[PDB]
Design a binder for this molecule. Sequence first.
Ligand SMILES: Cc1cc2nc3c(=O)[nH]c(=O)nc-3n(C[C@H](O)[C@H](O)[C@H](O)COP(=O)(O)OP(=O)(O)OC[C@H]3O[C@@H](n4cnc5c(N)ncnc54)[C@H](O)[C@@H]3O)c2cc1C
Ligand SMILES: Cc1cc2nc3c(=O)[nH]c(=O)nc-3n(C[C@H](O)[C@H](O)[C@H](O)COP(=O)(O)OP(=O)(O)OC[C@H]3O[C@@H](n4cnc5c(N)ncnc54)[C@H](O)[C@@H]3O)c2cc1C
Ligand SMILES: CC1=C(C)C(=O)C(C)=C(C)C1=O
Ligand SMILES: CC1=C(C)C(=O)C(C)=C(C)C1=O
Lengths: 273, 273
Amino acid sequence: VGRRALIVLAHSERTSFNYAMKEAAAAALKKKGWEVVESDLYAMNFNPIISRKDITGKLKDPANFQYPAESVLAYKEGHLSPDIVAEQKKLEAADLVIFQFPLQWFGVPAILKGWFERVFIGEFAYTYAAMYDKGPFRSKKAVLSITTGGSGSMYSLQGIHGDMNVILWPIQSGILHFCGFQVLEPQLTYSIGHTPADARIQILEGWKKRLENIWDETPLYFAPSSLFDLNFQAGFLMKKEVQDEEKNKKFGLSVGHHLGKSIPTDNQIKARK
Amino acid sequence: VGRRALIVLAHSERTSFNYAMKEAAAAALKKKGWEVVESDLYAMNFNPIISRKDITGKLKDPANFQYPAESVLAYKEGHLSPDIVAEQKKLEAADLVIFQFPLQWFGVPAILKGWFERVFIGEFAYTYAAMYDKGPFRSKKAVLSITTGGSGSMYSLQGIHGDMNVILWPIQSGILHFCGFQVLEPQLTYSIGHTPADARIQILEGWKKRLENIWDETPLYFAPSSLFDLNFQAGFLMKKEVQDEEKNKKFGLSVGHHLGKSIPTDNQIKARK
Ligand SMILES: Cc1cc2nc3c(=O)[nH]c(=O)nc-3n(C[C@H](O)[C@H](O)[C@H](O)COP(=O)(O)OP(=O)(O)OC[C@H]3O[C@@H](n4cnc5c(N)ncnc54)[C@H](O)[C@@H]3O)c2cc1C
Ligand SMILES: Cc1cc2nc3c(=O)[nH]c(=O)nc-3n(C[C@H](O)[C@H](O)[C@H](O)COP(=O)(O)OP(=O)(O)OC[C@H]3O[C@@H](n4cnc5c(N)ncnc54)[C@H](O)[C@@H]3O)c2cc1C
Ligand SMILES: CC1=C(C)C(=O)C(C)=C(C)C1=O
Ligand SMILES: CC1=C(C)C(=O)C(C)=C(C)C1=O
């Protein structure tokens, strides 16, 4: 099970619904016996820009600086910027990780984007040899709690913005699952700006009720890595056997692995039934 | 046609291939007669975090600060932070805009994400009543020149990362097109770290050759906003006539508007033939 949780909030105002959503989760989770630690990026005045300043010490190749390689070495030798190590320390301790934030330009705030870029250093958060389901955080579970200005109908299949499942994909699969995280259904609260005072209240109430049994929830589906030849030779492509068995299926495996066919309904919003 | 171009670069190293790719474009476009203006976010030491400080003056509602409304007002009244405004002035002048950056966490660098969040202010970049094809930038064209550590096969329909067309969707449709931009085909150069010195030189040459006639290119396909009822009541949903006529189509309209069917091949990578 899980008893330790980290809530990473990306909002500057203490009056926002996002903050309200963060306080409700901490209060709910706490009541159920969890330990709740936070990362109010704004309040921490967190540095979102990856630079050679993230490595406190000597670089292996100062004249030809390559962030990936240097950052991995810095993590390995213990030369990572102190504020980065502090966050990593929180992640290593967390069983459940909540990302509370308002949708901005169809994605996460720049400060949160920068938190991933600086904290999810190779070896620590991922390894080509242990990608996705085999990643470092496979024992962990992440949830995105997002609020939007636009109504849900704008993100439905025929909504002008297009399917939300596509929007969520690059983050839930590309960032979260890539590191091994089991990603639970996203807590989506649309057009929070057009919601009656009384409903907003139930929204907080519903989120708390959900967190009461969040650890026992069924995680979203991602094609298992076993279906792929995880070697550079085969070009990390899906196994021939698997490709053949699938040629007879109506739907694709997921949003990214739609394979040219139909994408399973709410693949990134709802867990299989 | 186009005479002026803006190149937005998001990389810290003057030794990177991105910088090389940025120099290549500047040189090529200049040689064809273009005026080339730059935004080297890192060199400009650009601030990517939206804050109430983006508003130089009084807020309509300091107690309950809401960025969207306050920044739109500040724009209208002329109270946007000078650094933001200077970028907006670069956008209003440019015909072609190139976004040169390395793929980071299946998206754009946080410093660039922050650049969109602070620069793409309501009324300036959007209009709601003038979304997408009817946006403020409809007379301009945007192009993404991306570099990746992962090979192209990792991003193929069978690649372990999944289809690259989904990754580009939230950026090309959600950010650029949403603002009216005509988005040209992305310049995708994969696993640049596993590319021989001789090939790298060709990549640079190929990029320059394309920019010779880039303005004559056929932009990517996005479902026209005419297929939707662009108002609150209707929920910005696709028109019934449109829905029915489409019911008889093998393929969906695009990555976001897949409508539950097959997604047109390379919808976000290749323009219709
Ligand atoms: C740069 C930028 C980009 C954006 N991009 C997009 C996009 O791509 N797509 C999109 O759809 N939207 C977008 N938005 C809009 C954004 O998603 C919404 O403005 C945001 O989610 C609104 O929620 P909030 O919590 O931030 O704050 P608020 O607007 O404050 O709203 C919370 C509401 O709940 C009330 N409230 C606060 N606390 C409580 C409480 N404890 N109990 C009950 N009620 C409470 C408040 O009074 C308020 O009315 C963008 C905004 C910005 C600034
Ligand atoms: C936080 C983070 C997240 C990332 N996330 C992802 C991801 O999601 N997916 C993914 O695939 N990758 C990812 N990457 C990898 C990243 O995309 C690559 O490391 C980057 O694109 C490599 O290109 P570069 O230009 O930055 O720099 P460099 O690695 O320096 O490589 C450029 C190469 O070209 C050479 N070169 C330089 N100038 C010239 C010139 N003028 N002519 C010829 N050769 C030249 C250099 O010597 C070098 O070998 C991530 C990296 C970071 C730091
Ligand atoms: C998100 C959003 C919605 C849904 C609106 O109705 C209006 C008026 C604005 C400005 C806005 O930005
Ligand atoms: C912040 C913001 C901007 C700038 C817009 O252009 C639109 C349409 C929405 C919803 C929004 O919430």
